[PDB]
């Protein structure tokens, strides 16, 4: 009969938006059977108090799925762990909205967690397809190492093995290091001149100001950086001509909620038409039984999707994070962010705007040297 779908949103207004979206989704296919009520809660400080709130405010109403969101004020120092751990005990699926850290891409830790954005590792796939079109082969990978280097570098290397071309010396550095010029000096005397950067926000600023003092960006030394490398520190600590990347939607939580409920509502009632249906446990305390139909709900929700909404066309992959995303190629020209192209899928589409390379040489620089 009545089913519930919880949510953990950022601000008060987003709760109203979620309620409006759930009402709209209910209004479409509500021919008896389901009514699809909703339950709400807001982000709270600390972390232990949060994991307790889920057990007494959300799980206490038989929630078929929890819906996380990024906190408004703080940075990624408080990415939502407790919801995944607490709800993961009963194998209750949780849908992510704007969480990108590449640690949830595996299921060894987060048993049941699937998002709607390619977190950070899929940026490596662009590096392959973008490199072919602009005629450069040999690369050097300059990456950090806390967890991104173990994943972002690994994905590119294993994907480039199909071409039988291997990357050059893949160096690394400890997080939050200073005077990295000794490590960079080893890279200075090498072959490839297409150095790829992929690190954290604070870390990337250190490399930029250090590389300037070593005259490593004057001509024919192209750069390639991820979304976070450019971010908000490109105003006063960046060279001229770094080709970054930016997600087309990103921080647009208003649109994602109107489509996150568009896939859950489609899949909840499909499961409701079946033989063995079991509701989830009523209370956290006193129960230690796994939700029997939990694995079934996770499987069907991961495969079908296909809800054609405002964010494009959602289609989850084999392990979580949604595939087929719309990227956009940035560029830096006189401290500006003019667009250069568009990535839709498996093919980069250039534009009619000429670009400027690091040195003003309006041409295709030779990577080999």
């Amino acid at each position, epitope marked *: 009969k009545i089913v519930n779908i919880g949510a953990v949103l950022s601000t008060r207004k987003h709760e109203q938006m979620f309620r409006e979206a759930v009402n709209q989704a209910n209004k*479409r296919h*509500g021919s008896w059977k389901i009514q699809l009520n909703a339950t709400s809660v807001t982000h709270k400080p600390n972390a232990i108090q949060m994991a307790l709130s889920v057990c007494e405010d959300l799980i206490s109403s038989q929630v078929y799925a929890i819906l996380v969101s990024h906190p408004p004020t703080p940075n990624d120092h408080f990415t939502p762990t407790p919801v995944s751990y607490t709800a993961g005990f009963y194998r209750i699926p949780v849908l992510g909205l704007t969480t990108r850290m590449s640690i949830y891409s595996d299921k060894s830790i987060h048993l049941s967690f699937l998002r709607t954005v390619p977190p950070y590792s899929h940026q490596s796939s662009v590096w392959f397809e973008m490199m072919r079109v602009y005629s450069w082969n040999h690369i050097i990978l300059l990456v950090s190492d806390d967890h991104e280097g173990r994943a972002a570098q690994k994905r590119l290397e294993t994907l480039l093995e199909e071409r039988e071309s291997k990357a050059e010396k893949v160096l690394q550095f400890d997080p939050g290091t200073k005077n990295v010029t000794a490590l960079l000096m080893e890279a200075k005397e090498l072959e490839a001149r297409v150095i790829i950067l992929s690190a954290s926000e604070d870390d990337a600023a250190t490399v930029y100001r250090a590389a300037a003092m070593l005259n490593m960006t004057g001509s024919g030394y192209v750069w390639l950086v991820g979304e976070r490398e450019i971010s908000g520190n490109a105003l006063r600590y960046a060279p001229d001509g770094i080709l970054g990347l930016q997600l087309i939607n990103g921080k647009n939580e208003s649109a994602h909620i109107s489509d996150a409920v568009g896939v859950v509502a*489609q899949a909840v009632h*499909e499961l409701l038409e079946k033989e063995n249906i079991t509701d989830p446990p009523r209370g956290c305390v006193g129960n230690t039984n796994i939700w029997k139909t939990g694995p079934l709900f996770k499987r069907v929700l991961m495969s079908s999707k*296909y809800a*054609d909404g405002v964010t494009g066309r959602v289609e989850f992959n084999e392990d979580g994070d949604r595939k087929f995303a719309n990227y956009s190629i940035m560029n830096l020209q006189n401290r500006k962010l003019v667009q250069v192209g568009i990535y839709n899928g498996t093919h980069v589409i250039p534009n009619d705007r000429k670009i400027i390379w690091p040195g003003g040489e309006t041409e295709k620089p030779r990577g080999y040297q």
Partner: antibody, heavy 122, light 107 residues
Framework: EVQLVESGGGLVQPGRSLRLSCAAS????????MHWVRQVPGKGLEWVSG????????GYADSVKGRFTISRDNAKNSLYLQMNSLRAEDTALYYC???????????????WGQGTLVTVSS | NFMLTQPHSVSESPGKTVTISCTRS????????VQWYQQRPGSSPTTVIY?????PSGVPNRFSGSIDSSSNSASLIISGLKTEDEADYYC?????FGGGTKLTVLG
């Protein structure tokens, strides 16, 4: 552009069977579900059945249930409606329609087909 | 279920505004959506207005939506124009279609 083509119907004696065919062109065949809406001469329209984007979500009307079956193939962009044990009151045209979402639950439809003709009589 | 009803026919000389209703049998009309269909005789039905008050790409505006509750009904409001657009209409909500009314221009 988007266009739906269907045919393969004619007068059939009562108690026999038939199998129409509806083919698509243009729009992607794997992204949108399709229905089967039938008219009635003189009177209004009515609903018959529907098919999901791939499979699994199959719906039927009241009298339609059990008598007819519906299946689709994603390779050659075709839609099939298999029926048997027709009656005298099932004389009408039959239209092919394409939905808007990836499922038949919304009951929405746009870009209708061109119709056909099937009649049951002695 | 229910039964959707509407007036049998309507006529109007060009220039003024025509009104077509579609009355719900049981339950609130706002519980589910409403859409209308445009079909010329001998042709195939095509969508004119869908999802309460919206127009698909190609509709020349003019036609407007109205889900005013009143006595549990839903009307169709069209601005003043006749031209060659005068034929039968159907209102569909969920698995059910309307009786069908036609627009007869006055000559």
């Amino acid at each position: 552009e988007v266009q739906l083509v269907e045919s393969g119907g004619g007068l059939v004696q009562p108690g026999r069977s038939l199998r129409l065919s509806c083919a698509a062109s243009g729009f992607t065949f794997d992204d949108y579900a399709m229905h089967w809406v039938r008219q009635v001469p003189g009177k209004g329209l009515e609903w018959v059945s529907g098919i999901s984007w791939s499979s699994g979500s199959i719906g039927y009307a009241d009298s339609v249930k059990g008598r007819f079956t519906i299946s689709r193939d994603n390779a050659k962009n075709s839609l099939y409606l298999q029926m048997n044990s027709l009656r005298a009151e099932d004389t009408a045209l039959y239209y092919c329609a394409k939905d808007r979402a990836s499922s038949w639950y919304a009951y929405g439809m746009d870009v209708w087909g061109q119709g056909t003709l099937v009649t049951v009589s002695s | 279920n229910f039964m959707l009803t509407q007036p049998h026919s309507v006529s109007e000389s060009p220039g003024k505004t025509v009104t077509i209703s579609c009355t719900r049998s049981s339950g609130s009309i706002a519980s589910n959506y409403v859409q209308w269909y445009q079909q010329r005789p001998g042709s195939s039905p095509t969508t004119v207005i869908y999802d309460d008050n919206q127009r698909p790409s190609g509709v020349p505006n003019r036609f407007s939506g109205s889900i005013d509750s009143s006595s549990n009904s839903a009307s169709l409001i069209i601005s003043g124009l006749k031209t060659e657009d005068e034929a039968d209409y159907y209102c569909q909500s969920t698995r059910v279609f309307g009786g069908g009314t036609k627009l007869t221009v006055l000559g």
